[PDB]
Ligand binder design. Structure first.
Ligand SMILES: Cc1cc2nc3c(=O)[nH]c(=O)nc-3n(C[C@H](O)[C@H](O)[C@H](O)COP(=O)(O)OP(=O)(O)OC[C@H]3O[C@@H](n4cnc5c(N)ncnc54)[C@H](O)[C@@H]3O)c2cc1C
Ligand SMILES: Cc1cc2nc3c(=O)[nH]c(=O)nc-3n(C[C@H](O)[C@H](O)[C@H](O)COP(=O)(O)OP(=O)(O)OC[C@H]3O[C@@H](n4cnc5c(N)ncnc54)[C@H](O)[C@@H]3O)c2cc1C
Ligand SMILES: N[C@@H](Cc1ccccc1)C(=O)O
Ligand SMILES: N[C@@H](Cc1ccccc1)C(=O)O
Lengths: 614, 614
């Protein structure tokens, strides 16, 4: 049942769409709104899976749950003030757990046919990098990641006009960085990182090493500009403490759906075109809907205000098909189109292989155990992340680990036991790659038959609907790269697989359950994003645009929230959520979340790890 | 003056457009046609430059001409039967000269920070490749290019149903190859070459070596399918004898313009949209024109039949904007759009740096002289090709070289002198790269000020209009890669530069003199090009499509000619030019051209090289 008219029509049930609705209902007393989502699910590029494995351990119809992510997976307590405020208002802080990023040096590295560990790579003044890559002398004997850091320090040094003092470097800092810092008299948003490092004197061997060692080679090889590249590369410092949700990032959009009401959310309802009815000064939205039978249906409805919570490709499709846009004067039509081109499309993919037990621990490899964080490679895998069965005791040990406490031998012995026990429960690996590596897997995923473990139904009760199996060809090639990376003959067949290629589609032959947008976006060369962003808040009277793609904090939920807040301010009078939170609470979202989590983790530790913890 | 109506409207003055017009006038008695070209020039992706350098040698207002190419540059006597027939009918055979592809082993190779020669790489059972790349044992001790050849032989071996016997392997053979040969039960057009070699057991190190050593990394890293990849990779065998035109490939389209008449050719006239007038059963073409003042102008005219001699991107623009296409039923509209997606867009670029003298000969390097053919590198240059001042004596020596004659010491001594003399005349290097390397140069080309040698006007009289200078940043980075590749401290500043990035544009901010299509196209994964090709001949009644992009012989003029011939057959009754040539002449275009060139080169040799030659 699609209403004949609403006061606010929201297009897209991703974070931007759900967040708009929630804030409008809760703070602007707007009850007459509706959300229209082309897919059969909410959340967009947040997409968690909770798999209930048959527990077939010896002493066990009992079930073990493995959380995995097909989209976003992690966040930070600082520099994400809207997100934190959002978590606190929805009361989700008690589900926050660690997202560790290292195994104390045991994580794998695979480069130029050679498998080794992070610890190994440090040995002998980082000698291994100078053996694998033909580096200039000034490039030898230093940790590759530290080259990125040093170059960052150099950019700041030669831009003394640019105030580099704030301790928390959020979207503002990063915008001024790319728009006002220069190199050789050209501001960074006119640079590519590839050109920049080359101009600075780096060898192409060194540059290849960097874009392979860092995982996201798009920062170097795509059309994104060097300033925004650096915002992403300086997001994963050595000392990072990322967190996530026990049940996955989808906890967040599922919570918003609850507050919104499923009755206002129209799934399998794609907005095809938008026109303006000059008589009653209202927009007219043409849609297509698929009921639960397959019964297709076309229709139309009106809205006083329209909120397009949509990325670049989706906006371009609407723009091309929409009289509201076509009726515009030539000059402004073309200017608006050119503005949509100012953010690069960044493909990403995640392929998840689940296993009845984990095989990368010392028991199965005979080598130092791999636990958490990226296993990087110049293979097409890009980055490989382990996930483990949900386990409260394990999460507590990880919480203890987030402190830089010195356990006594009793506590170290218990932590040892907990670290080893996770290998005996179901687990998963995520292959997580970008740009240059996409095409290897997409051709593999669409060829031949799909993978299913025999007796799959005996292994997992219900397989979530958003799971499309990896192709048999994907599993076989992934299995061989895993043997390379983890330096082991032993990599068994997965119990369950999923493949998700976040690469926008323009082909009408693709089912709706397989149409996905680009993974993230990043400002292109020459893009003055300060102008672009304000231009896209409300490009036509009462029609708004918002989301990650043209945001301040690309690649992250926080960017979607901040871009949406701009729409909520200009079109509805609402101040930014983080400022509203601080007005209502007397303190920042950031301080609040840290105090609340500290308390939760304090008691988690005392209860599971060390009864006498500080 | 744009006619109110024509019987045939031809859109695009590239090879397909000019060739359509010429054959229609000459063979179908169609005089009432006109060509409409959006740019200020004919020829499209064929674009030669003839630069007249001030001759500032000691004993010399005399001029020296350097031919260069910004687009296509070479052809073959076999497997290009339409092109050869076309050359013969236009009487252009006497301007055909060699296009040599090697320097007897002295061409440069630069990989993983190491500069060496083709001869060097052969040494010690191809040891250098096993030192630079961490190869499997089965991958060691073999010439990299021979891995591609061997794998080709393996594909044929396991497809005995596929008749692999014809000596001249033209478009038909290559189509059946990619559509009917399989690997592991999947036909090649469902494969990517990257996936294919990986599945066959090759190391990623070996695969990286191959796509770097072979120049065109798009065959591996793009979305083109493995079958068409192989058509391109098996086009440059060791023993190739390419030819070209003394004054450049544009000799061909300039000759067609002459036969057509400039009066039927409408430059700076872009067709924006197409509609069908059901009353008088005629198409209505909306255009925009820019006179010689900058005076813009919009208008409309009708045509009985429309020939779109246009590549993928240009066709998609028209399709989106055209009522003739929009009025189509949903199902067929989407099917036609999806069909346009079946050929991948392959960016290419050429950056030409001209020098008053050549600096890569032994006199200037102290190393074995570099003469002709690609200098490959894993640097962003991709491939570097030398060009020399036009010189009849040099062309004769090259003609002698095409024979595998054994000169006596008198003839060898003269050839030695001729080889060395070309270094003392103006010359040029072309940087010629694809896919992965494009983004490095485009960001560099659009940053900062453009390069001009001081006193440029004293060095070259008139600079052709199609020359856009390379950026200063492009020249500085090219200069350093040249020192790397040619292993020399000495690389002077160029007298003149051009940059051409064959990468399609969707941004209204780009001048028309800087809008260029994608370099070439190649069938995508899953594309049944036999179905696609016939579907695109005449997608609407009396509206036709033709050109390289959706052709049988992608990457080459011959593909444009063959795709156009299909339009000439279906819509106008003309048989293929090569069959028409053979009917009129009693022998094939291929035999004719070889005999005529043999005669021309025979007399060229006797006159310049060896008075007593066989
Ligand atoms: C692989 C990956 C990992 C990530 N990891 C993280 C992470 O760890 N941390 C983090 O903070 N961020 C992460 N992100 C980013 C984060 O997921 C996104 O920034 C955010 O979820 C996107 O929200 P959005 O509302 O802007 O767009 P989307 O999530 O893309 O929502 C747009 C919605 O609109 C719908 N739609 C499109 N067109 C139409 C139409 N015509 N009619 C109706 N509906 C339509 C789409 O189906 C979709 O649901 C990740 C992203 C990717 C790709
Ligand atoms: C770098 C490079 C090197 C190459 N080297 C070789 C080689 O050595 N040998 C070889 O055989 N082939 C070579 N090729 C391929 C060869 O140049 C092409 O296959 C052929 O010239 C293309 O002809 P076409 O008519 O299909 O298209 P195009 O040459 O692209 O012609 C299309 C024309 O239509 C015009 N146009 C577009 N849209 C409109 C519109 N709306 N209204 C009006 N006009 C419009 C364009 O300006 C253009 O002039 C090379 C190609 C590239 C990119
Ligand atoms: N939040 C993203 C960050 C990202 C942005 C852009 C590209 C890739 C990654 C992540 O965790 O992976
Ligand atoms: N004729 C092209 C062949 C080619 C096709 C496709 C891509 C690249 C090159 C050339 O000489 O370069």
């Amino acid at each position: 049942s699609i209403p004949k008219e609403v006061k606010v029509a929201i297009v897209g049930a991703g974070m931007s769409g759900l967040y708009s609705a929630w804030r409008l209902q809760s703070e602007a007393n707007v009850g007459d709104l509706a959300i229209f989502e082309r897919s059969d699910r909410t959340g967009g590029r947040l997409d968690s899976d909770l798999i209930e494995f048959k527990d077939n351990r010896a002493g066990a119809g009992s079930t073990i749950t493995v959380k995995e992510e097909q989209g976003g997976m992690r966040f930070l307590f600082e520099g994400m003030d809207d997100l934190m405020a959002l978590f606190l208002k929805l009361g989700l802080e008690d589900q926050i757990v660690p997202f560790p990023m290292n195994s104390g040096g045991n994580n794998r590295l695979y480069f130029r046919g050679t498998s080794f560990s992070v610890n190994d790579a440090e040995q002998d003044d980082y000698h291994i990098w100078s053996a694998l890559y033909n580096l200039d002398p000034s490039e030898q004997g230093v940790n590759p990641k530290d080259i990125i850091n040093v170059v960052f320090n150099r950019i700041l040094q030669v831009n003394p006009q640019f105030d580099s003092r704030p301790e928390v470097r959020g979207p503002e800092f990063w915008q001024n960085f790319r728009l006002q810092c220069q190199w050789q008299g050209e501001p960074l948003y006119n640079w590519s990182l590839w050109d920049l490092l080359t101009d600075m004197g780096y060898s192409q061997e060194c540059i290849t090493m960097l874009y392979r060692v860092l995982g996201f080679n798009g920062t170097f090889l795509s059309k994104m500009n060097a300033g925004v590249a650096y915002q992403l590369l300086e997001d994963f410092p050595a000392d990072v403490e990322f967190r996530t949700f026990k049940d996955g990032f989808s906890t967040l959009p599922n919570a918003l759906v609850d507050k919104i009401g499923k009755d206002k959310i129209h799934l399998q309802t794609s907005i095809d075109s938008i026109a303006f009815d000059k008589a009653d000064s209202k927009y007219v939205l043409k849609y297509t809907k698929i009921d639960q039978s397959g019964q297709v249906s076309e229709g139309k409805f009106k809205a006083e205000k329209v909120i397009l919570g949509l990325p670049r490709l989706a906006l371009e499709k609407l723009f091309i098909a929409s009289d509201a846009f076509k009726q515009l004067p030539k000059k402004r039509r073309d200017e608006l189109w050119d503005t949509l081109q100012s953010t690069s499309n960044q493909p990403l993919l995640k392929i998840n292989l689940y296993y009845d037990t984990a095989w990368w621990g010392t028991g199965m490899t005979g080598r130092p155990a791999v636990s958490f964080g990226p296993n990087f490679a110049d293979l097409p895998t890009g980055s490989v992340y382990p996930f483990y069965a949900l386990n409260d005791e394990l999460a507590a040990a990880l919480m203890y680990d987030e402190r830089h406490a010195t356990p006594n031998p009793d506590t170290q012995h218990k932590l040892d036991g907990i670290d080893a026990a996770k290998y005996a429960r179901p687990a998963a690996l995520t292959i997580y790659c970008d740009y240059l590596n996409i095409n290897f897997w997409s051709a593999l995923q669409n060829k031949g038959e799909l993978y299913h473990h025999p007796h799959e139904s005996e292994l997992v009760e219900s397989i979530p609907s958003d799971i499309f199996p990896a192709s048999e060809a994907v599993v076989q090639q992934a299995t061989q790269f895993f043997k390379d990376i983890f330096n082991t003959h032993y990599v068994p067949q997965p119990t369950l697989t999923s493949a998700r290629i976040w690469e926008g589609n323009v082909n009408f032959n693709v089912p709706e359950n397989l149409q996905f947008g680009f993974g993230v976006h990043q400002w292109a060369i020459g893009a003055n994003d300060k102008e672009v962003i304000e231009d896209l808040v409300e490009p036509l009277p009462n029609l708004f645009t918002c989301g990650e793609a043209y945001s301040d904090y690309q690649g992250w939920v926080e960017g979607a929230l901040r871009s949406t807040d701009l729409v909520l301010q200009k079109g509805f009078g609402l101040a930014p959520l983080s400022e509203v939170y601080e007005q209502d609470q007397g303190r920042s979202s950031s301080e609040a979340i840290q105090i609340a989590y500290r308390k939760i983790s304090n008691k988690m530790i005392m209860e599971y790890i060390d009864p006498n913890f500080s």
